[PDB]
Design a protein around this ligand. Sequence first.
Ligand SMILES: C=C(C)c1cccc(C(C)(C)NC(=O)Nc2ccc(Cl)c(N[C@H]3O[C@H](CO)[C@@H](O)[C@H]3O)c2)c1
Ligand SMILES: C=C(C)c1cccc(C(C)(C)NC(=O)Nc2ccc(Cl)c(N[C@H]3O[C@H](CO)[C@@H](O)[C@H]3O)c2)c1
Ligand SMILES: C=C(C)c1cccc(C(C)(C)NC(=O)Nc2ccc(Cl)c(N[C@H]3O[C@H](CO)[C@@H](O)[C@H]3O)c2)c1
Ligand SMILES: C=C(C)c1cccc(C(C)(C)NC(=O)Nc2ccc(Cl)c(N[C@H]3O[C@H](CO)[C@@H](O)[C@H]3O)c2)c1
Ligand SMILES: O=c1[nH]cnc2c1ncn2[C@@H]1O[C@H](COP(=O)(O)O)[C@@H](O)[C@H]1O
Ligand SMILES: O=c1[nH]cnc2c1ncn2[C@@H]1O[C@H](COP(=O)(O)O)[C@@H](O)[C@H]1O
Ligand SMILES: O=c1[nH]cnc2c1ncn2[C@@H]1O[C@H](COP(=O)(O)O)[C@@H](O)[C@H]1O
Ligand SMILES: O=c1[nH]cnc2c1ncn2[C@@H]1O[C@H](COP(=O)(O)O)[C@@H](O)[C@H]1O
Lengths: 346, 344, 341, 346
Amino acid sequence: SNAMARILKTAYTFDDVLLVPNKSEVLPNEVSLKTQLTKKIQLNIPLMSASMDTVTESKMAIAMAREGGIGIIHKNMTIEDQAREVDRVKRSGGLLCGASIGVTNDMMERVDAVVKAKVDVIVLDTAHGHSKGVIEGVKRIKAKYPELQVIAGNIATPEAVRDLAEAGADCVKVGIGPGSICTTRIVAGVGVPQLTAVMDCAEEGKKLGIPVIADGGLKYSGDIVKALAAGACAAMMGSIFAGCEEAPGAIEIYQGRSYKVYRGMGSLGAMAFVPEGVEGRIAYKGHLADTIYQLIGGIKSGMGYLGAPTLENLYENANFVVQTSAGFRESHPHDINITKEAPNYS
Amino acid sequence: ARILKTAYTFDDVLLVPNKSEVLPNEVSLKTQLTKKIQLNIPLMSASMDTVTESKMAIAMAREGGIGIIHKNMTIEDQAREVDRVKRSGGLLCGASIGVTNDMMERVDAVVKAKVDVIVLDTAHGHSKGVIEGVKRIKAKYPELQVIAGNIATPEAVRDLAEAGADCVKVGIGPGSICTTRIVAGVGVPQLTAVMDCAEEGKKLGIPVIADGGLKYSGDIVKALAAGACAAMMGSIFAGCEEAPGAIEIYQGRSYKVYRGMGSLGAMAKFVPEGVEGRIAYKGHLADTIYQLIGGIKSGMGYLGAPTLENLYENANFVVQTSAGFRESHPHDINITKEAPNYSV
Amino acid sequence: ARILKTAYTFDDVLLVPNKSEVLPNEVSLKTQLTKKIQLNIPLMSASMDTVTESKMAIAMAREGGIGIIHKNMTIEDQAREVDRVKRSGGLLCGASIGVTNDMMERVDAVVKAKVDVIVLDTAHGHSKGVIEGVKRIKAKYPELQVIAGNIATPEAVRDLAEAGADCVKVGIGPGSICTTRIVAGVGVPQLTAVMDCAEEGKKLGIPVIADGGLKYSGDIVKALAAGACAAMMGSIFAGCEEAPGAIEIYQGRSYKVYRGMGSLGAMAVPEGVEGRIAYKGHLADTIYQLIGGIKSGMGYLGAPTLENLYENANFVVQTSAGFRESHPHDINITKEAPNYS
Amino acid sequence: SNAMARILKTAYTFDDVLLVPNKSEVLPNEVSLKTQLTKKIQLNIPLMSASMDTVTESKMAIAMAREGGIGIIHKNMTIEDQAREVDRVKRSGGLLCGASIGVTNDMMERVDAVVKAKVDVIVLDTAHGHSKGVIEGVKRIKAKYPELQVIAGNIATPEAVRDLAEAGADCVKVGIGPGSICTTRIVAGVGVPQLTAVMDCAEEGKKLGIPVIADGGLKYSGDIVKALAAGACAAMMGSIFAGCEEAPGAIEIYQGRSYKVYRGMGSLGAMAVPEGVEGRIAYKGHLADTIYQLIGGIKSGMGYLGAPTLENLYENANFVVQTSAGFRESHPHDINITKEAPNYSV
Ligand SMILES: C=C(C)c1cccc(C(C)(C)NC(=O)Nc2ccc(Cl)c(N[C@H]3O[C@H](CO)[C@@H](O)[C@H]3O)c2)c1
Ligand SMILES: C=C(C)c1cccc(C(C)(C)NC(=O)Nc2ccc(Cl)c(N[C@H]3O[C@H](CO)[C@@H](O)[C@H]3O)c2)c1
Ligand SMILES: C=C(C)c1cccc(C(C)(C)NC(=O)Nc2ccc(Cl)c(N[C@H]3O[C@H](CO)[C@@H](O)[C@H]3O)c2)c1
Ligand SMILES: C=C(C)c1cccc(C(C)(C)NC(=O)Nc2ccc(Cl)c(N[C@H]3O[C@H](CO)[C@@H](O)[C@H]3O)c2)c1
Ligand SMILES: O=c1[nH]cnc2c1ncn2[C@@H]1O[C@H](COP(=O)(O)O)[C@@H](O)[C@H]1O
Ligand SMILES: O=c1[nH]cnc2c1ncn2[C@@H]1O[C@H](COP(=O)(O)O)[C@@H](O)[C@H]1O
Ligand SMILES: O=c1[nH]cnc2c1ncn2[C@@H]1O[C@H](COP(=O)(O)O)[C@@H](O)[C@H]1O
Ligand SMILES: O=c1[nH]cnc2c1ncn2[C@@H]1O[C@H](COP(=O)(O)O)[C@@H](O)[C@H]1O
């Protein structure tokens, strides 16, 4: 007869999908990477460094802003220190600066301090943004500071986009469990594969007039293209920047190789417990400028392939196909002994 | 001969976050193992001669869960193990029973030791022997709580509930030490088996246990969200200090023995349906339970669930590919520090 | 002026045996000192300058209990002492705090050293100084576990709980070296004090410590059965090798110094005396005997655990003739017993 | 000078030699391990823990003394902290205690403080004990504190035993370059293989009535037996003790293995060009379990040599040299070892 079936939707990450080429009348050197992070704030490139104590303090935020993106100063420091870090960025030539805020008893004291330091945007930043504490936190902050730009996260559903927008958020940050250092999905069982999360959240954001950020799980420049084509206004990265000279931490040498420490903000070491992150090391990659150069070149390439002179046109005309694990093997270089370094592929 | 659908295990799915007004410290983990038996936490140790004797059962009960004393010992020895648990403070205790000639003698002895629940536990619970065993036990001991298993279908839930079972145990082939699916070709991926059976149990008012295949705390959250009243583990507890067997050292690492009850070694106490081996020593049970419970409480916070029933009622799963699985785990990082709830 | 009732000490009372299904060896002695601090055995060493420094505190923690480092030293030294215990491998450690001008700066240093619990310890814990002290410490360190004492009434339990104490310590005048009752006229016999204060603490969810007056392992059973979460001892531990002070010999007998912190010596109108007690050797040997006697009593009371012990505790009062029956009598004891005088 | 460079002889380490069994009328349980560390200090067992900041503080010294040996508190701390450390050991039951001293401008100030804390022996301890600084230091200390017992080192020649004895040392410590964490021989080219160094220095020491300590390079209990049979009054170990619970440092876990930090005092990290390295060794649990194995091995060796006492062991010990082929025979060979032995690893 006609049978009863279990309805379970498949959700996709970046490695599950590829963008289909469009007719193109634009060369990659003709495209524009400008984006609205919020209605108020424009970025020259759609890239953000993560608010992590192994990724962004003022050194990284200054370099990020000079490249045309933005850094979010992490909050694993006293209120006074975080205000000093923001102020250091703001004093370095009018550069944009963000600051992370938690759902804490001293939440507004921290907001007041970074506001006095002239922070451009705050990120009310929690493991579970679709929550009463974040919703009320946003309302409180916007009641006191109606023109202060507020990003709220992290979330993974359209319903969360709508609730945080109604609460007064100027932008929402998408990502539950995709981070390279993240164990949320493993230890709590919860998350949404990040390409689907970004797509579904950005679609709701577009209807509401609120942008969304694709936060976490990005490894290659092509991953960022997919996130922007899916509708994200900007991409946030920890792992891709944590090995740069401008990130916190010393350069460590071991058996002829250079490393920097990178760790989840929910790892034991960062929290110092039931942790939701791990602690480790990644390759030292040198100055941020050289990593940004490769990322931008890759984004401009993808836009050339899709005929997009702007990021809005990229989203409007992007079509995806799903690839299998065998397609993934074809997409990567295969059947070759790679003997020389490539600046954008490892 | 027909292909019904794709069936999923825990690693195939993820739970979607819900709007939440409850923090992880505000949630309740209480659960009805049967209508008569409540657990403070939804966790059980397996009835395996390398997992649960009285030492483990006492520890499990003091943590709020329950141990099932295995049956690879004489009847008198199993009765004395149960008795040691019950005298240690009215702690809950279970006991495994097989489909054997002396089945009722063994039931009589653990009933005398005041066991709270027996598990009539077989490779194939959806069988005449188990059905007739449950009916015989309930006829002599109408109020004795009986778990029957193992099973993997809604039909088996119906047939065991009709026989008189107060709870049914799901899992055909998911065990870490299990070769049933390989040697016999039979089984149902465990997440689908639990969703299918727990939905059937809910209609009939009979709880179901998610037994086998659990590796991380998030796997338990998925099993509870799918509707199981409790989760049963061998591998996760077999390395604990309270499990049977000596701590053994090999090249600077501490190990304990862990084996299937259908392995040659356990049956010798011949076509086996299990293997024998070693897993890492984990220290005291309390530290493992703390991580499991913290992960469960975190998952319930993400789903806005103050109770296990609300967790089930509002749980939505999505399927992830193997690319999604690689994103879900830590990736592109050389991990250099131990984490207490994650290993690779 | 009114006489409320007769009040009892440990020697006034005996526990009635219950039907039991537990052997002593199967018993569990874990207890919650506070909501956050669990002990494997319900025993604490007193914060006196002849009982607990880091050496004693480490030994107590290794045995499953805890030691409270006395405050008769500079702030810097007491932080060093706490430091030494905490760096000795994740052992629990407490520290004494007084109602003093430098109270918060002493608290600041011991929390810096990662003390697990503070004891705001005065002669009269039911006082404005202690109540406001507790309030000040809790406002600055909301997570810091705080024991407040000493007290002897349920009203004091209620007031210190409302001030934010996580545990209260009971004992006005029972100490072996104490003269408070003789010089001030004030105190409550300790078994009644513990039972009346624990009853109020149970209703508020706040544990009580039975501090002082314990001589034998059976006394500890009575204090725990009366409702205390833990027993604190000075005299029983002062003769152990791990307590401060040298071993002194006289007439073929070994002794150690033991004195009240309100005695003239310690303060250099006293409420304590100074003297000597027998050397007992290593703490481990004393703890073993205390734990054996406690497990024996719980066996007799059918209590596999300590909360069940309070619930099922029935005392009878004995006379001085009953007391003479309870002790060995009409025997010339010729052999030493490890748990009896 | 008309002298010329020359090659003197072949020199041997412990792995180069074996002790020949003697006629025995003594069982291992009948032998006595007592030894004179100096004319005034007797030890119940001939074992010492090294004065390193990853081996011996008050906890280790207390446990070593409880076992019948002695610990030397390291000097990588303020004078006050080292006096406090000696004080903790002394008040723990009158246990023996040692303390390290360097050739520094504040040498006498440090000596004064540990003397007040009632230290039983100081070790004037430098990379090159056969030097003017150490000789004058010993003389200066012996002038102010004639009764204070003084060990001086490290040395590797009979001439150095003679000169330190003439300066007033009560005991000399032998070892240039044998340490597990030592690179002196690699970076400076200097040292003497430790068995020959101990044998030759102990020969001079017995002629002058001054004991000598065998410091460094010991890995197995049988190595201690060789060092004592060569005439050392005691054996000093860093590596064998650094993994014990009583040594300083946290227990680190990595891939199911427990570790403790161990590093040379001449390494970059401890100095805070190097002559040591920094690393990790296996965690061993409590000192008592390690001592038990070492003492049992020593007693067994004394049984094999019919020695009821350490002086008898030395008087009647005969060595043979083994080749690298004899060494392969001496270790287990041609076996897949499947069970841990408590006194044999790798
Ligand atoms: C990025 C991640 C994963 C991370 C970073 C640093 C730390 C963490 C840790 C490891 C601390 N885990 C969580 O915090 N787990 C969590 C789970 C469920 C829920 Cl519901 C919540 N609630 C959150 O939102 C509430 C306000 O509404 C707050 O109380 C806040 O706790 C948290 C995780
Ligand atoms: C958990 C596993 C896999 C396991 C544990 C220990 C031992 C076993 C062994 C290795 C013995 N294999 C089975 O027993 N294989 C089996 C296969 C098909 C069927 Cl139908 C049955 N029948 C079962 O149910 C009947 C009730 O009537 C019983 O008589 C009983 O025989 C068994 C396996
Ligand atoms: C008897 C013991 C344990 C002892 C220990 C060391 C020393 C002492 C000495 C011998 C010094 N005697 C007292 O101190 N006697 C005393 C009597 C009555 C009162 Cl009311 C108070 N003080 C109270 O007044 C403040 C009111 O806010 C509170 O903070 C609280 O300190 C003290 C005695
Ligand atoms: C145990 C070792 C190897 C060690 C431990 C910690 C640190 C060191 C360091 C790495 C510091 N290296 C030396 O110190 N190298 C050295 C080489 C040749 C000579 Cl001659 C000397 N002179 C020494 O003896 C003189 C007595 O007067 C002193 O002045 C002193 O300088 C030293 C090494
Ligand atoms: O410990 C954590 N657990 C889970 N997610 C984390 C944790 N710390 C940081 N994150 C998230 O992971 C992102 C970085 O991911 P990555 O670019 O893939 O390394 C951050 O921007 C946060 O959204
Ligand atoms: O040898 C056997 N073959 C198949 N399943 C077994 C065998 N022994 C135990 N089991 C099952 O495996 C479960 C433990 O699975 P684990 O938690 O994944 O190690 C037990 O609770 C039993 O249900
Ligand atoms: O001099 C004092 N006067 C009154 N009580 C004191 C004095 N010094 C210490 N105490 C108390 O007496 C207890 C020890 O009593 P013991 O165990 O009977 O020796 C300590 O824990 C304090 O509560
Ligand atoms: O960094 C250093 N370089 C050379 N020798 C050292 C250094 N640090 C300690 N030592 C010596 O090495 C000994 C320990 O060697 P082990 O017992 O073989 O590990 C110590 O007792 C010192 O004599």
